Amino acid sequence: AHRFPALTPEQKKELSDIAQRIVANGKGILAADESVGTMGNRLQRIKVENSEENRRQFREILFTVDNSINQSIGGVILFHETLYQKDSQGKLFRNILKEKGIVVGIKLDQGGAPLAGTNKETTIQGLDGLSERCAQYKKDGVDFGKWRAVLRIADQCPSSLAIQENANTLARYASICQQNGLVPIVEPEVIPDGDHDLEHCQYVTEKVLAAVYKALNDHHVYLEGTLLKPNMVTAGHACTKKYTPEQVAMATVTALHRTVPAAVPGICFLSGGMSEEDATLNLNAINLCPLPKPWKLSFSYGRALQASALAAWGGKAENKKATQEAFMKRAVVNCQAAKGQYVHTGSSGAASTQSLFTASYTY
Amino acid sequence: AHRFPALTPEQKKELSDIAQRIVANGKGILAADESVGTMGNRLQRIKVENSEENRRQFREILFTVDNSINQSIGGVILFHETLYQKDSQGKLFRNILKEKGIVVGIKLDQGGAPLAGTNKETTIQGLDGLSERCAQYKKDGVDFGKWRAVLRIADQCPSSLAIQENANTLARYASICQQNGLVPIVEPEVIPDGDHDLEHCQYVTEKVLAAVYKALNDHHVYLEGTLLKPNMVTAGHACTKKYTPEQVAMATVTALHRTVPAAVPGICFLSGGMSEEDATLNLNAINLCPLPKPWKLSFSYGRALQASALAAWGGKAENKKATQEAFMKRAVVNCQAAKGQYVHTGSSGAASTQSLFTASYTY
Amino acid sequence: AHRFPALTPEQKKELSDIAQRIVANGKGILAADESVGTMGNRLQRIKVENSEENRRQFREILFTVDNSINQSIGGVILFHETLYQKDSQGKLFRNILKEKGIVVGIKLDQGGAPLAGTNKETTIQGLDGLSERCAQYKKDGVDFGKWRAVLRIADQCPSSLAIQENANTLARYASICQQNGLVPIVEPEVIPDGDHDLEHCQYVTEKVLAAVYKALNDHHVYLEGTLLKPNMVTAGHACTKKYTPEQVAMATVTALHRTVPAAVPGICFLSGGMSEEDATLNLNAINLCPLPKPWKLSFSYGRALQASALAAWGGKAENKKATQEAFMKRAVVNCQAAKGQYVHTGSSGAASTQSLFTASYTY
Amino acid sequence: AHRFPALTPEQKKELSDIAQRIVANGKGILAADESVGTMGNRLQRIKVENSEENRRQFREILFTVDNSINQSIGGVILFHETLYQKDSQGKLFRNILKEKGIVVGIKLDQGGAPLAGTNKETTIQGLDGLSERCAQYKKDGVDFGKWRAVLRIADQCPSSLAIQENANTLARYASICQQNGLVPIVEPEVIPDGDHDLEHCQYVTEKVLAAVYKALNDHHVYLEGTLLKPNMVTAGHACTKKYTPEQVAMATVTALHRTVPAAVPGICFLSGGMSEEDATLNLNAINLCPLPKPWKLSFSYGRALQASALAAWGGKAENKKATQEAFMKRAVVNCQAAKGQYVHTGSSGAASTQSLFTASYTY
Ligand SMILES: *O[C]([C]([O])[C]([O])[C]1[O@@]23[C](OP([O])([O])=O)C2456[C]O[O@]42O154OP326=O4)C(*)(*)(*)([C@@](*)(*)[O@](*)(*)P(*)(*)(*)(=O)(O*)O*)=[O@](*)(*)*
Ligand SMILES: *O[C]([C]([O])[C]([O])[C]1[O@@]23[C](OP([O])([O])=O)C2456[C]O[O@]42O154OP326=O4)C(*)(*)(*)([C@@](*)(*)[O@](*)(*)P(*)(*)(*)(=O)(O*)O*)=[O@](*)(*)*
Ligand SMILES: O=C(COP(=O)(O)O)[C@@H](O)[C@H](O)[C@H](O)COP(=O)(O)O
């Protein structure tokens, strides 16, 4: 069996070079891969029409921000459409990103398909022609892919059928990417939907992650050239029990250190519909947790990085600067959280006769 | 788990009605699903050009033969292209077949894809959008699908990765078909390529078939509404050891009765590049084997049913009758073999002063 | 893998002969392998002390019946103790049984062991030194064994760990028995405890049996030289819904023909604490079921074959006759039932009268 | 599934404390669990009769060394016999060890059992009554156990049956140990027998370990309260290719960081019949390997810690000193090696001189 290696040293070399480059120095990933539909929901909240032009206009503002973002963002996931668009000067977005030293990625899955005989559980489509597409994307400047699997917690969920299917499909996609020079981002998301508590989520997350890594081993996937994008362990949305960032952090690292091999260079958490503040505090807490953490604990945020930026835009180029600033702040803040250096409300201890201030009363 | 049934009684009812109708009375299946390329190879052997018109012309002659064929053929597998073609009178082929009471099927897989880290082993593509396609095919008169998985016997082959992937993909396709009213023909073919002997093939066939049925159970597939299309157990093509129809029959039924549940209504063997004569003798022997046979043992032949017909054609409508006759003979003969009633060279015992003959000398 | 056969042609033959011999002609098995702890419960009810003598006495009465029982019983499963006991004249019980042409069997499992992290689920012990034990038993005239695995239906039961464990443990035992010349009776019992209905039981039983036979394949078990002793598909003991023999038969044969290979010679149903009457009726119905049945459908009854004999005995030696006649009575009607040739003169539903097992107090 | 915890917060704590205590500060384990049959081979070479006394005498010399060994050895694995023996003054060996602050362990497996249909592959026995055995051992002062599983590299080895069996048997043992308060040392050994090279060993070891940890997850084993004792990645004994400690270290740490979770406190390498020198050198190198190592990399040596002491003893009581000094000598340099603080003054390849284990005669 060892006489039929999946990759050559050169293929392994390029994969690890990319995987590490994306998470180097505490950098994270901007998940700007919202499809037309999803982007429509975003734009709808700010009373803007969902048209290719308005989508392009927003993405343009994010990608053309000060080159300083290459200190916080090491990669960006794009939706197919955007990979071929241009800014207002004819410059291709992908080339703008690359000039700054940012790695470009592409969403590779094609949504979910129903699994018969289960309680509303799915699997994911997208394997057909994935190789040709990856080779092509590779020519067009993409260096990494992203596949999202969905597991739900409910009555009879997740089932072993759901777990085994999604794990092996994820492993298939991973293998195919590596064969074409793309670093696969494995995203086994256990959705927050439900009234289940923290503890119930942590249990399920471990089970899914153990199945995921076993499948990857069976499929001969090169761990050093991959990235994991799992959910943080948290209670469900409809849960009454409220938890702190420290509790969530503990549950998370506990689940992760019992399943994810150290060969994996970086783990980037998905924001999963979290508020910008929570996504930062939790990640910070995750990097402060005393448990063994042999890999980078970063972020791969979508709305936790764009929520306020979209709000400052309003569909007016007239508000470009504010949009760029809102994005910049969130990127800097999360990069600090990925280093466990995010001090929340300012950085000053008790005082009031400290030295020469200005911070007092109000305004 | 039992509270989320995959199918309703009505869905189960229609599936079993179709599966049984195809193999009733000893009828078999004409596998006329050769793609453009494959059909090109066929036509090339008779010095005919591979064009949609010549393909159509041949298929036309087979489908318009005497209505008597509904006594031997219960189903026909078509390649997509042919499902929408017509005869020389504007009659759609699918409607011609149906008027005679023949069930129409369609090839659903899209070929194989390489499995990295194995010794040239593959998996099969085609799941993406399979549901929409099946629903559509259903509207267009198709009642059953066919998916072909390939397993090879060689150094490190078949591997457990290859076996588990192909079994579960086959189970996926099966589930999807049943959800759309199509009876899935599960074809786990262990190819004859190689110098391996009979015994080595029988071992591998059982292993693959056991994995197949386990996967189908995990995926909640309704066995009563399916059909199996496996290879007969035989030595490899490059094997020096020659075996008789009786030896092949024994190995086959032995492998089949130890793995395929009795809930399965019919097993139709693929011809696997066998000569027209062998495909008939072996199947006959398979039905004469004394072992337990709870299911129909029929055929789903391609070139074992067309070889001589293609030869009588030559690309001339002028030779239509001969083509129709060659096909008819092969269909009648194989239907007899599926009943264990195929007497080979005529039907007369020792004699020469039996009564009033004519069969003697030569000519 | 084909160059390392588990058994030789010779070993296979013997295993095939023993298995077929036991279930031939409608004959069943007497399950008299009650442990001293389990036997003490039976004797207690009839006011007899649980001593080695009383156990021997009763079992002597049963084993010394007229030679005719060899037309009803083809095998007897013994408990270790009884395999070395003698009748009132110094003659070994096993030798008496042998001279009547009955095949002797032995219980090989050593009870359950809890699986941590489950809801009161267990696995079975008895693998240690089992090979030596089997070799010795074979020298002492024993030709087959019995291993009982228990799976329960409840909250989170039966889990996949429970199913994989019991299935695989069951397969190890089977491989070991065969290596020593004994035919292993595989008994995966889904206990009737609980308030689940017929369909829940059917679902679980098909699931359990599919795992069992996949496990036996992985372990290279020769199915032709094995026997199966599964539960019948019935509602739980605490289920209020009433089911007739016809329904119980349909659900059962349906579960069996979807999972159990035709290679298995026979399926000897366990009585599971159901009335002597019900064990007979359900059995008769199962053989009258219009579904495909490539295997013999017989019985391997304990209480259902001994209840009356025990009650008629009462511990008094003078009741030898009434005890023997009662036993032979159950042995013959169950043999009839095994041929579907049983006719019960009497009509009822759930209401009235079967004052003789009105209804047990379960457990 | 989350409502049925295997262990309580209290039980977990203790398991965590014991495991960490053993490998803390660079300390390793003394593997003195040689069976009488295995011990008799050691004594034979030094011309000493294999009697219970001679075995006791030697083991007395080792256990009665200066209190300082508690800075090198954190645990000792005992063979049943030795767990109840006393020194020349009626004091229990285990009590001597305890007063030195050393944790006592016990060998729990009962040898291999052949798996039919494989190429001389085996599984391990010892599950029967193991729980009671563990409870008693715990009362007698034992805090951890040892279970050795053997996997070989050869024609068709190690098969998946062999891998699934040993992995799952290894997991049952582990769950049972933890339920009784003992920390299970999981030892999946890929034996060095054969002519395979470094890469073949690395491939198999990663495969075996992946199965092992997936199995431990299925069985709900608490990784934080376990320890791993795997083989080092080396070429087979009959391999001509020479490898340095650096290469052996690279291959080993590579296999480990891809499969072993950071939740596991320590990895104590088994010596596998390699020279005392090599066990030390390879160990030092492994800790100097620049790959991620979230676990302690220590030793659990048998021969490699006792070879010199034995040779210096010679069976003569007068050689107590030379025997103790020799032992402490190996115990300290191996503790240094466990910290990567070992320095060997001496240069060579394959040629010359190590006249003291020039090279063993294997097996
Ligand atoms: O049912 C059946 C069953 O399954 C069996 O076989 C029986 O058994 C039990 O006991 P207990 O008390 O615990 O519950 C046992 C086991 O362990 O073992 O058994 O095998 P066994 O001996 C039959 C019998 O029973 P009944 O109730 O029915 O009589 O068949
Ligand atoms: O190596 C190692 C191993 O792994 C082990 O531990 C050993 O051992 C064997 O023996 P034999 O003779 O059979 O081979 C055993 C088992 O069974 O058991 O052991 O655990 P044990 O006691 C170590 C040791 O060895 P050496 O050679 O190295 O010294 O560590
Ligand atoms: O949390 C996430 C990303 O950030 P959000 O914007 O959703 O907070 C992920 O769960 C997914 O990207 C997203 O919601 C699902 O959309 P998809 O990519 O499958 O079409």
Ligand SMILES: O=C(COP(=O)(O)O)[C@@H](O)[C@H](O)[C@H](O)COP(=O)(O)O
């Ligand atoms: O034996 C067979 C059918 O009859 P033949 O014409 O090949 O003898 C089967 O093995 C397959 O149909 C065929 O050769 C492969 O072509 P495909 O369908 O995958 O594109």
